[PDB]
Structures are given as structure tokens and as C-alpha cells.
Design an enzyme around this catalytic site. Sequence first.
Site, PDB file in Angstrom:
ATOM      1  CE  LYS A  10      -3.915   0.000   1.143  1.00  0.00           C
ATOM      2  NZ  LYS A  10      -5.245  -0.597  -0.327  1.00  0.00           N
ATOM      3  CB  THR A  57      -2.438  -3.408  -0.802  1.00  0.00           C
ATOM      4  OG1 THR A  57      -3.854  -2.446  -0.844  1.00  0.00           O
ATOM      5  CG2 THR A  57      -1.526  -4.151  -2.034  1.00  0.00           C
ATOM      6  NE  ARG A 176      27.602  30.038 -10.161  1.00  0.00           N
ATOM      7  CZ  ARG A 176      27.183  28.867 -10.731  1.00  0.00           C
ATOM      8  NH1 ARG A 176      27.211  27.968 -11.838  1.00  0.00           N
ATOM      9  NH2 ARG A 176      27.473  27.664  -9.839  1.00  0.00           N
ATOM     10  CG  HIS A 256      20.535  27.703 -15.115  1.00  0.00           C
ATOM     11  ND1 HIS A 256      21.837  27.585 -14.364  1.00  0.00           N
ATOM     12  CD2 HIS A 256      19.678  26.485 -15.272  1.00  0.00           C
ATOM     13  CE1 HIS A 256      22.100  25.961 -14.616  1.00  0.00           C
ATOM     14  NE2 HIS A 256      21.269  26.009 -15.332  1.00  0.00           N
TER      15      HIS A 256
END
Lengths: 301, 301, 301, 301
Positions: A10, A57, A176, A256
Site C-alpha cells: 500500500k 494491501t 552569480r 538558473h
Amino acid sequence: SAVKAARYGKDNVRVYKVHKDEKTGVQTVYEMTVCVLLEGEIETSYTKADNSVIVATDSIKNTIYITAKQNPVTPPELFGSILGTHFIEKYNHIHAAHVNIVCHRWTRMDIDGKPHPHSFIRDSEEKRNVQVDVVEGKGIDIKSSLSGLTVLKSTNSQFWGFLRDEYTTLKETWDRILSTDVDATWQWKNFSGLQEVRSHVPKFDATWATAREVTLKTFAEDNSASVQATMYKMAEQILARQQLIETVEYSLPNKHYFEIDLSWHKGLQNTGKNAEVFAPQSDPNGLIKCTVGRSSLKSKL
Amino acid sequence: SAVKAARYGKDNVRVYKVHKDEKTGVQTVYEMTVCVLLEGEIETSYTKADNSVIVATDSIKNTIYITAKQNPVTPPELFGSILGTHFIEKYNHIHAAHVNIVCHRWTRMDIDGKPHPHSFIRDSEEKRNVQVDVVEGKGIDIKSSLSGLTVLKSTNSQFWGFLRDEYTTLKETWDRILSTDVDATWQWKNFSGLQEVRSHVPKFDATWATAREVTLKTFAEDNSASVQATMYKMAEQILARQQLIETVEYSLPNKHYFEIDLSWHKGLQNTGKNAEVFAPQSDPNGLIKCTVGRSSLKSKL
Amino acid sequence: SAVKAARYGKDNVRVYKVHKDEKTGVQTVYEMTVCVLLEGEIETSYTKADNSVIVATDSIKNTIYITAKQNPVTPPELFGSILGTHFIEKYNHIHAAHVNIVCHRWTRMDIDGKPHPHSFIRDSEEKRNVQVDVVEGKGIDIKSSLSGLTVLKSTNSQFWGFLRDEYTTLKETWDRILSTDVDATWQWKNFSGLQEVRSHVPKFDATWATAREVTLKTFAEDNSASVQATMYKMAEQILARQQLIETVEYSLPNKHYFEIDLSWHKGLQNTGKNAEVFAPQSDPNGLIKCTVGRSSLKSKL
Amino acid sequence: SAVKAARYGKDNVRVYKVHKDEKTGVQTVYEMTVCVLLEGEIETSYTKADNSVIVATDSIKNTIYITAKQNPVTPPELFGSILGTHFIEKYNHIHAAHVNIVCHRWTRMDIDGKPHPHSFIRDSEEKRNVQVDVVEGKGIDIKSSLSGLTVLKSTNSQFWGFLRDEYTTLKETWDRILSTDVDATWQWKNFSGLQEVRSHVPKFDATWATAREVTLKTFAEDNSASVQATMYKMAEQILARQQLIETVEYSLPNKHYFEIDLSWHKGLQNTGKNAEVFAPQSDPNGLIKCTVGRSSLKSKL
Ligand SMILES: CN1C(=O)N[C@@]2(OO)C(=O)NC(=O)N=C12
Ligand SMILES: CN1C(=O)N[C@@]2(OO)C(=O)NC(=O)N=C12
Ligand SMILES: CN1C(=O)N[C@@]2(OO)C(=O)NC(=O)N=C12
Ligand SMILES: CN1C(=O)N[C@@]2(OO)C(=O)NC(=O)N=C12
């Protein structure tokens, strides 16, 4: 044909738990999303329509909630180990349990400068995760991580000296922006079983805190030569601070932020030293990965 | 046929701006997503293939970046007003500019207990937004908001006394979890133009801070009779604290956390006073809205 | 303070319904997401903690499922009208019901060239939607739409002759890609009540089909002067084909595909007539809107 | 410390390519998202701030577009192999290239029953993917897949005979809904290099078509004992139809649709044989996986 590999279970099981201190009134909340996938002698469910070997499950889901009711849910390394151990011990024919937990932030609110006893804020989508693989006869393998930790620095990042050939257009830069979403994972020494996990319980929260602290301080303080160089520094420091970790992995996007040349409009200067307004790029993005372990080289170092 | 309404422009314009104090070294960053849609004497672009009336959306994009280079981007109410005013003044035939700004969080990092000069963390996906409608001859209409502020309280929420009929299954409760994602909007008095907006600039950050403070404190402290009752208290307090606001709107999902009856398994008690483990429900969700203004009733109060 | 506006209800209610023809074996499925928000004499739930006026959102949810069990769920215009009418008729103090339905695609599979009796594919994330506002004493206002219809044409789109000034960098083009996600809405004449809606039932599916057909054929065949010009042609044709529609609205992103100059690498030619490889841009995007109705100008046409 | 593993490159590179037949007028479009990550003698970029060993991710991006300009982009297995081969051949110190491609659907529109020469529809968010690992000295390893193929059948699914113990609440069923999002992967025999890949080019589109056909027909026609049993049948058929495949993997969520007991309201019958209205569950979900290969057992079969 034959089954070469199989696992099932599950996924996406949302779980909340509260702790109430009836003396003090202080309540504490935990929220997670859990996945448990099982392996074992299950191949005939695939090949022969043999459902007798399937722990449904739906039952796995029930088990997650019952285990959370009967045990602490923190640290997640412990909860996952308890949960995984249950499946391999309860069911003779189940031989591995793979437990993934994503922990969601519920940070206590401060109201008028005082911590509130029962109110919380999702102060970040950053997650704390575990992957706990409980394998019968081979112990418990735990990978702990933080993810979704989004950061930016506006200077003290550089990128120059990279390979230049006929495919290269990128300008070298000495100043930068650097921004990323940190995904950092520390892989523990194999544990023999639940007792050994329990023996190290305080180390889990402490190592998560160390990893987060190192990440933030190294990002903020490293005058970065590259993502590669900075992330390696993070990993080496985390390894130095917890000997029960074998490896540290980082996976970092380079999100960026492009300069915008505005010189075509009234000679506006917005590049280089005069760059103030930038265009964040949604895609594409660099993606930089490494796994760091301890050295064993004794010559040619 | 005829054009009854039209607007067009550039959406999803990501913008970053940095401020660098060269004396102190402290840098400060701003990031937003901008949309500008224009109205005016543009119908022939639709009916007659007359592109002469179109200020290209690409040019609108350029204009957003140029305006950010030439002006402060904070508070967003001001930036949006500058931006919108530009379009209606520059272009005779454009008569309205609709500027939406979503501001993203970049909170300064504290490293070793000291604020870092150029490193930031996305400490929440909560947004601060504006909607600025600049309409030629009718001033500037501003709606400010906070959104994506996700909170939970583990007790001191109730819901009883609601209508019960043949469609009702819900149990009354005197102690439940309450969780929501707060979307709160305050609508300003119409401003005559950019000068009047500028005259009130400090009020924008101050009112955003008030709205956030009131939201958090009222959520945390109100022993809530309903979402409806709690949200009304928030709105009435914000109105009391800023006379230049005309209305406050809240839109609040009720993000349900269901009890899990485990009594079928070994008589485990996990309901009522013994409820510890809950199932967060992704959907459906209650959705509760109201717009609050100041009263004008003088009789039958 | 006073409540100026209020509405509340249940959002994100997922609903499936099956129809089984026991004679033929053919099954047909419907899946939707439903929101119902109510208005009325509810202000004291906000101002006075008066829950007696609240039809609980949980009860609204129950009502959605009961109404789907007792009525057709198609066309969605009808289902929404039934649902909304129920709330204003059942509850004296509720005076408006606002029903939004998103219909999900489950298209019957063809297997070996034959339609399968009970297997379906989500053949597109395109949706068919309604907004049905049932207002006591003022009938039923319906807006129908299609959304999420994503298309691209590789030529026969142009954009030239737009305004050029000191903010303009965009090159004119006589041959470009055009791609969008179509959101098209048709607004019906007010209906007096449920009987009038029922009287027009076949028109709902027929008008949706017309709107989709017109959209696709006009997109494919118009050698487009602009998004504006093309979308207007769509709207005018839909109005011509259904007199019970008052207006048609389109909202269209211009999902830009940029040329990539590769002439810096070995003189590769990839622009203009030689453009083959393009960079899809995620953001920003143009966003072009209009609402078209029938003309009433008799002079200066 | 030391680097135990490292890879880096450019992710989320969106690429469009058009083919124009100038004789016929027919245009054909391709759109993808590409990731390329490189490995090699790069550790000093991490440990020593040695950027000389870095082929910049920006250059990797340029290379993706140049390679798409100079080569076919279809089948994606071929394009990925060309791309990956380029990096290991061009750069002596790069020894592996890991190329992931997601192919987006652009299906040609039919207008008035005729295929249009240059207009396309995103007819599904289903993807066709490849993972191509080009490893110097060890050839080219390709995994092909389809994903995001969302299907539902309204009957002819069962689930009974599963393990029942004190953790089990699930009712056995002989007639339920089954819905999933198919992720199916076929793993090719290792190829020695680009020549061997090229030698098998027609097999790539043919095997994708087989895998999709088998998936749909087996889903539609199997009166399913479980997800496990059905998915195994798919895999065994695909293996039987392409000897150059070594394994087939499926990963299938069980997207649950719950019955809704309405008997509390006017004795409405909506369960079992009378179930018509269901509640789709967003979470949690079963998740069922297996990898199937060809048998090598000769005894105890
Ligand atoms: C700008 N830039 C690149 O072009 N490649 C790099 O990752 O994105 C790289 O390899 N490392 C960086 O730090 N910066 C980069
Ligand atoms: C549990 N519950 C409801 O069923 N309706 C309500 O909104 O979701 C409502 O109208 N107000 C609530 O606070 N709580 C609710
Ligand atoms: C390229 N381009 C613009 O720059 N503005 C436009 O919308 O995006 C516009 O107004 N109409 C377009 O069709 N194309 C455009
Ligand atoms: C209803 N159900 C379960 O509870 N477990 C199962 O996967 O979700 C399982 O193992 N296989 C199923 O097909 N159906 C299931």
C-alpha cells in the site's frame, strides 16, 4: 516465463498522530505519508491466480494505523523499522518489507512570543524521509534524508574554468546567483535487527539536525567554485560528525537565474556589476549528484 | 457578432530583483510571478485581423522587467500600481491594466545565530499577492492577500448544533482537529491614482503583517464553534485595525482528519477521548467563504 | 462589522456512476468532481456561532451521492440543475446553490476493432464542465465549457503588424508554431427552473459537440493572423449554430515555441526556412481572452 | 572522504522538432523532454574545485539541440543512443552517458474525416519513454516504457481468496471496478554500440505498439483474479512476441473505487448487485510490481 522480481503493498497512506500531555496541556502532532511494499514467496499470486499468499494491501493499510497506535511514530527510522519487522515476523512467507516514510512539517506556533500548546504551522514543504528495508536474515538497511529544502544565495557563487570547445557558449562568471532544492541522504551502517536500531535512537534526530545545519551553513558560507565543490564539502562534514553513517548522497538542481540585457532600451545597464533584475528559469536545469564515503586509499592520494 | 469583453497580455512572468548595500554588504532579494492583462480599444484585433492596436505580449514582458529595473518592487501594491499606470498613460488606446503579482518567500538565513548577508531560504510556500486594477478615469483598485498559509490545531475546535435531517450522518463533536489553507484578502478604498497609492505606502506592509498576525492568533486562541465563526472574528479584527480597508474576504477549506475505529482489532481504543491516530482526508473538503464589511444597520441590529 | 457575502459547501467530491444494460451487457461509466456551495439566511453562523442554519458540508456530500443514485448524471447541465434545485427547494432558508462539475473522460476501448462492453481509457485530460447557479426566484444560470484541450499547429500561423515602440524587441513573423490549451465557455439563456432545463436536454450534448468541432476545425484551417483573430472566428460560429447561447468566451494561452540559432556551431542553419528544432517555453506565456455576443449596432457598423 | 559515485548533467530539456515534406505539404511534429547525465574522471571537480573536467551542463543542453538538428529524433531509443554515444566518444574522460527521454503525444488531427497536414492534438498525457545508458566498453543498455496510460473496467475484476487474519477487514468480492495507470517497461538485450542499435531500429516502434496492444487487450479481456495475475499475463505475452527483450516490468497502482452504502437514506440500495454510485479514492492505493523474464527451470516446474 517466470517472476524475476516482485513486490507489492500500500502506497500513499496518510497518517496523523497526536500526543497529549494531560498534566501540562501541551499537544504534539506528527503527520506522514507511508508506503509499505512486501516481498517473499508470492510468485504464485502472479503465475497461478493464488491469492492465498497475498496479505491484502488493505490489511497492510490497517497494519500501518495499528502500528502507529501501539508505538511511537518518531523518529521515523524507528517507526519504519518496527513496521517492517512486523511483516517479516508475522508472516513466515514474507521475507522483506520496504517502508518509505515522508514526514510533513507541523511546527508549533509562537503567539505573542510564547509557544502555543496545540496550534501548528506548515513552516516549509521541506520533508524529512526514511527508506527502511527490513530483509529477513540480513537485518535493517536505513537511508535517511531531507528533501525540498529550497535555498538561494545572491552572490559568492562562481563558475569558471570549465571545459570550452565547439559546443560551448556559456560565459565564465565570478559572481552569480546560486539556488537549489536540497535532497540529501545519509546511509546508515546495516543494523542486525530492531534491538540494534533502538540502541541508536537518539542518533537519528541528532544526525538529521547535523545534516540540515551543515547544509545551510556550508551553502551560506562557501564562496562556491561550483555546485560540485560545495556539495562535497557538505558531505565530508556530515561523515566526520557521525561514524555510524557510511555514505552521504546529494542530488542538487542548479536552478538558473539569467541576466537580462536591457541596453536596447534607453541604454539601461542591467548586466555584470549593474545586474539587478533577473529572469528565473523554470527549465532546463543543471542536475548535479554525488555519493561520498570514507577514503581507503593509502598511496597515490 | 460583437466583442462584449476582451483582455490580453503576458502571464507567468517570473521576476527576481536584488538590492545590494555596498556599504554594509547586506543583500536583499525579491522574487515574484507577474501577470499583466490590458483592455482598451482593441476589438479590431479580434474582428478585423488589425494587429496595429496590439501592444505585443512580448513587449508587455519587456516592460515588466524594465519597470522592475527602474522602480522598487516592494511593496507589491506599489509596484503593481506603477506598472499598471504605465500602460494606460503610455498608450492612448489602452484604458485598463490588470496586474496580478504573486510574491515568493525568500527569508534571510540565520547562521550560528546571526542573519546572513546574502543567503535565503524558502521558509514557506505561503504567498503574498496583489491584484491591482488600473482603470483610466476611475483610479486604482487594489486587493491584497495572503494565501497558502497552512495551519492545524489539535483541539479547541468543535462542531455541534448543525441542522439534522434525513440527509445527515455527521456526528456532533465537542473536540476535533481543525486544519486549513488560509486565503485572506483585504480590499482597499479606491485610490485616485499613483500619487494617492504612494501616500499610503507604509500601510501596505503594515496591513499585511496585521492580517497575518490576526489570522494566526485568532486561529490558535479561538475555541472554535465552526470555521464560519472563527473566520468572521479574524475579519472583524482586521477591519478594526485599518480604516482604509473596505472589506476582508476569507476562503477556507476544512481539511478533514477522520477518526479511525480500531476496536475490531484486539479491542484497541482509538476514538473519542482515546483518539490518537487519524486518517487525513485529501478529498472531499468543506469550503467556507465570507466577505465582511462595516455595518450600516441602525435598527433591528 | 457585517457579512456582505457568504457561501459555503463541499468541494472536490469525486463521483463515479455506472449504467449496466443487462440485456446487451454494455456498461457505460461516468466520472466527475463536484462542488456545491450554498447561500441564504446563514449570516448568524458567522456572527453568532449559530450552527442551526448550517446544512453540514458532510450532508451536502451525502446529498450529491444520493442525487446521483436517483437521477441521471448526464448531461452535466441537467444533473447540476437537479442538484441545485434540490437545495433551494428542500431548505426554506437556502436561496442559492452554486454547482460546479468537472467531467473526466472515460472513452470506451476498441479491442480488435470492436467497442468493448466494459473497458475504458482516459483518452485525454481534456474536461467538460458546467457551472450551474440556481437562484431562488431567478431561475437557473448555466455556463458550459470545455477545457484542457491542448493543440498545436506547425505552420499557418502568423504575427505581424503589431505596435512597435521603444519597448518592442519581437520580430514580425509570417510562419510560426501556434499551440494552446483551449478553455471555451458558452453561456445559456437564463432558464426559469428545472422544467425549462429539461425541455432543452438534447441541446447540451449537441452544443458541446459543436463547440469542440468548431474549435478544432477553425484552429486547423485558419491561416491565423493572431490568436485574437482565430478565437473570434470560433466564437462567432458557435453563436450562429445555437440560438439559446448568449455569449461565448475563450481563454487561450499562447504557448511559445522559440527558434534556436545554431549558426555559432559549424554554421548550422536552424532559423527561418531552415528551422526544425525549437525550444518550447514553459513560461512566460501570452494569455488572450474575449467574450463574444450577438451584435446590436444598427449604425456605424 | 572520497567520491564513491558521481553523475551530473542537464535535466528538463524541452525539445520540439518538425519534419516538413515539401512535395506533399505534410508536416510531422515530435516533442520530448530530455535529461543527460554524465559519468567519468570527474571526481576532482568535487574534491579540488577542478572545473577543467566539467563539460558544462549548458554545453550538454546545446549538444542535445545540435544532435536533434543533425539526426532523427525517432525512435527515441535511437536518438538516445546517438546522443549518449556522442558524449563518450567526444570526451576521452567521460565514460558513461545516461539519457532519459520522455516523448509527448502530438497526434495528427482528423478534420471532416481527413488527416490534417499540420495540426495536432495532445490526445493523452500517456508518455513513451526511454532510458539509454551508454557505458564505454560495455555497450548500450536500453529500457523502453509506456507510462501514464489510465484505464478502467467496470466489471470482470475479482479479488477473493486472499489471506485473512486479525489485521483483515476487507470483504471478498466477485465483481468490482479495476482502474490503474499503466507503467510498463521492456528491457532490451545489451547492444554492443550504435551500429547494433541501428540494425534493430524497426523493432523499437513495433515493440512499443505490441506492448500497448497487449496491455489494452489483456486488461479488457481478462476476467481478473487480481492485479498480480493480470499483469503477469501481459508480460508473458510481450516476451513471447519479441526475443530481443530480456525482461518486462509492470508497476500498477490499484486505484480504488469504494461502494457507498446509502441504506440509511430511505432504504436506498446501492451496494452489491445494486451498486451504481461509487466514491473514487485518491489515496491510499495498492501498488503492485513485478519483473518477468524467461524461465530456466528444468525440474520442479
Ligand atoms: C552553469 N553551469 C553549467 O553550465 N554546468 C554546471 O551545472 O549547471 C556545473 O557543472 N556546475 C555548476 O556549478 N554550474 C554549472
Ligand atoms: C464538519 N463540517 C461539516 O460537515 N460542515 C462544516 O464545514 O466542513 C461547516 O459548515 N463548518 C465547520 O466548521 N465544520 C463543518
Ligand atoms: C507573439 N505574440 C505576442 O508577443 N503578443 C501576442 O500574444 O502572445 C498577441 O497579442 N497575439 C498573438 O497571436 N501572438 C502574440
Ligand atoms: C483490494 N486489494 C487489496 O487489498 N490488496 C490488493 O492490491 O490493492 C492486491 O494485492 N491485489 C488486488 O488485485 N486487489 C487488492
